[PDB]
Design an enzyme around this catalytic site. Structure first.
Site, PDB file in Angstrom:
ATOM      1  N   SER A  43       0.750  -1.264   0.000  1.00 12.41           N
ATOM      2  CA  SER A  43       0.000   0.000   0.000  1.00 12.41           C
ATOM      3  C   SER A  43       0.779   1.313   0.000  1.00 12.41           C
ATOM      4  O   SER A  43       0.142   2.326  -0.256  1.00 12.41           O
ATOM      5  CB  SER A  43      -0.979   0.087   1.168  1.00 12.41           C
ATOM      6  OG  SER A  43      -2.073  -0.803   0.949  1.00 12.41           O
ATOM      7  N   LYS A  46       0.053   3.527  -2.920  1.00 14.67           N
ATOM      8  CA  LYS A  46      -1.141   4.420  -2.976  1.00 14.67           C
ATOM      9  C   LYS A  46      -0.706   5.896  -3.050  1.00 14.67           C
ATOM     10  O   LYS A  46      -1.418   6.739  -3.632  1.00 14.67           O
ATOM     11  CB  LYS A  46      -2.038   4.156  -1.760  1.00 14.67           C
ATOM     12  CG  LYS A  46      -2.784   2.847  -1.891  1.00 14.67           C
ATOM     13  CD  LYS A  46      -3.524   2.456  -0.648  1.00 14.67           C
ATOM     14  CE  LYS A  46      -4.507   1.291  -0.809  1.00 14.67           C
ATOM     15  NZ  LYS A  46      -3.739   0.053  -0.707  1.00 14.67           N
ATOM     16  N   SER A 103      -6.196   3.176   3.907  1.00 17.21           N
ATOM     17  CA  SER A 103      -5.687   2.084   3.066  1.00 17.21           C
ATOM     18  C   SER A 103      -6.795   1.288   2.349  1.00 17.21           C
ATOM     19  O   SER A 103      -6.696   0.092   2.173  1.00 17.21           O
ATOM     20  CB  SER A 103      -4.723   1.174   3.777  1.00 17.21           C
ATOM     21  OG  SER A 103      -3.664   0.863   2.873  1.00 17.21           O
ATOM     22  N   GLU A 139      -5.251  -3.952  -6.883  1.00 16.22           N
ATOM     23  CA  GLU A 139      -5.490  -4.563  -5.584  1.00 16.22           C
ATOM     24  C   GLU A 139      -6.390  -5.776  -5.768  1.00 16.22           C
ATOM     25  O   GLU A 139      -7.344  -5.696  -6.500  1.00 16.22           O
ATOM     26  CB  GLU A 139      -6.218  -3.614  -4.627  1.00 16.22           C
ATOM     27  CG  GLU A 139      -5.291  -2.448  -4.231  1.00 16.22           C
ATOM     28  CD  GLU A 139      -4.237  -2.795  -3.239  1.00 16.22           C
ATOM     29  OE1 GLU A 139      -3.452  -1.858  -2.912  1.00 16.22           O
ATOM     30  OE2 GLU A 139      -4.064  -3.928  -2.761  1.00 16.22           O
ATOM     31  N   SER A 210       1.281  -3.193   3.883  1.00 17.02           N
ATOM     32  CA  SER A 210       1.219  -4.506   4.446  1.00 17.02           C
ATOM     33  C   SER A 210       0.963  -5.507   3.344  1.00 17.02           C
ATOM     34  O   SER A 210       0.128  -5.272   2.471  1.00 17.02           O
ATOM     35  CB  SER A 210       0.052  -4.556   5.507  1.00 17.02           C
ATOM     36  OG  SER A 210       0.053  -5.811   6.138  1.00 17.02           O
TER      37      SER A 210
END
Lengths: 260, 260
Positions: A43, A46, A103, A139, A210
């Site tokens: 993440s 992002k 997230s 994702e 993560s």
């Protein structure tokens, strides 16, 4: 520097592989540990995607207010904000915030889509001088984190240099840079990672990551009490596919590198 | 029970005194450990203050838009938001967010003054049926957290009951309850505390607290995957004035009471 010995020690103890890049903007000095090795971003990617959207809004001046449809089939594995808006819409601003501060993986995929796929996130990286970042997948599969897989990776040096240009430099327009920094300073997920190793008085914006192989990451812009800002990237990955997250390793790395 | 024994084992190894109250709203069952002892609230008190201002905003509907002056003399010891606005102004909405999400002490002092002093915060507490909460001091002395001092304390049972009524019950009007929950869900400081002992899929709103004697607190509303919400209060305090924080202890608590 004893900092090298401390990070080595930390790494050995942890059983994994640790990457660190600290830029001190007071004098452009750096602290580097496996800083040219690739790591799965998870993440922390992002930030590139939200930034790229911000850059597009420099030209498309209403773009952040554009409603986007959230369908039930758009939901993925972690959708804390988007799940409230299924069969409705969120703005690109709402989505950028949800991706960065919560997230939210659904929100990230919408950013990805807005940029024309993982390649448009990579194109933006290239436009701002980052020749190392690559986003390859959406994702949640961008988080697989397989040892030796170059997909969805970057290096700590490159990510630190980019985060500097985005939050402190001139990669984005002044309004957009401000918006990015505001979003990052409001992150909800970061108190156990880099922030936990820093004095309480220091101000921080960060994005955590993560994924598989116990990959545990954080990238941060830091405004210390009494000092020019710092950029810090701490990347961490483990040998076992189902390894548990280790945010405390990142806290520890941050403590080690901001003593020295 | 097993949980009781485990919490006793955690406390015995922690170097301090642990307070826990878990309410499970699926069935109103509770898990209680020293839940009628008093502890210093520290910044967990900021929930009461924000709530009391939200209640005032039900009858003065522009209240949250009201500008409040921030003078250099107003700055206390931890002012991550208010320092940016010295010789300027913050709205009460900003002040409410700064206090809840960033634990800004200057912002809390403005909430307190808008409520007529610490007494006024207490009077709000009494008004929604909390006879245990007491706010006595302004920031930063409300955090001295001296053992045996009843100033600025409550008990875990009373705080869990109050957080339930504020976030899930009818203490506030619907708009205002929703605003409180939104602010709590946006907290920046909570990832190492109760949230760290819960599964990732669970949604949390929380407010942490830290003060003298290593006092380390967190109160939370929790929406577990697939289950009705929980209210969790974890309070911890240590015998030495300069003891270090122990967020890890609170995460361990949270894991023990939500495993069972």
């Amino acid at each position: 520097a004893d900092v090298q010995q401390k990070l080595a020690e930390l790494e050995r103890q942890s059983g994994g592989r640790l990457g660190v890049a600290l830029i001190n903007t007071a004098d452009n000095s750096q602290i580097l540990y496996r800083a040219d090795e690739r790591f799965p971003m998870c993440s922390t990617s992002k930030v590139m995607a939200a930034a790229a959207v911000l850059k597009q809004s420099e030209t498309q001046k209403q773009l952040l207010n554009q409603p986007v449809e959230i369908k039930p089939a758009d939901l993925v594995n972690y959708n804390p904000i988007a799940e409230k808006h299924v069969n409705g819409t969120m703005t690109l601003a709402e989505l950028s915030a949800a991706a960065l501060q919560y997230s939210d993986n659904t929100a990230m995929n919408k950013l990805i889509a807005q940029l024309g796929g993982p390649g448009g996130v990579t194109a933006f990286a290239r436009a701002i001088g980052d020749e190392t970042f690559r986003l390859d997948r959406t994702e949640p599969t961008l988080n697989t984190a397989i040892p030796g897989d170059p997909r969805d990776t970057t290096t700590p040096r490159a990510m630190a240099q980019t985060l500097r240009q985005l939050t402190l430099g001139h990669a984005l327009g002044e309004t957009q840079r401000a918006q990015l920094v505001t979003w990052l300073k409001g992150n909800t997920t970061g108190a156990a990672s880099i922030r936990a190793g820093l004095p309480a008085s220091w101000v921080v914006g960060d994005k955590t990551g993560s994924g598989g192989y116990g990959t545990t990451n954080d990238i941060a812009v830091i405004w210390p009490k009494d000092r020019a800002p710092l950029i810090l990237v701490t990347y961490f990955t483990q040998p076992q596919p189902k390894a548990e997250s280790r945010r405390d390793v990142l806290a520890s790395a941050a403590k080690i590198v901001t003593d020295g």
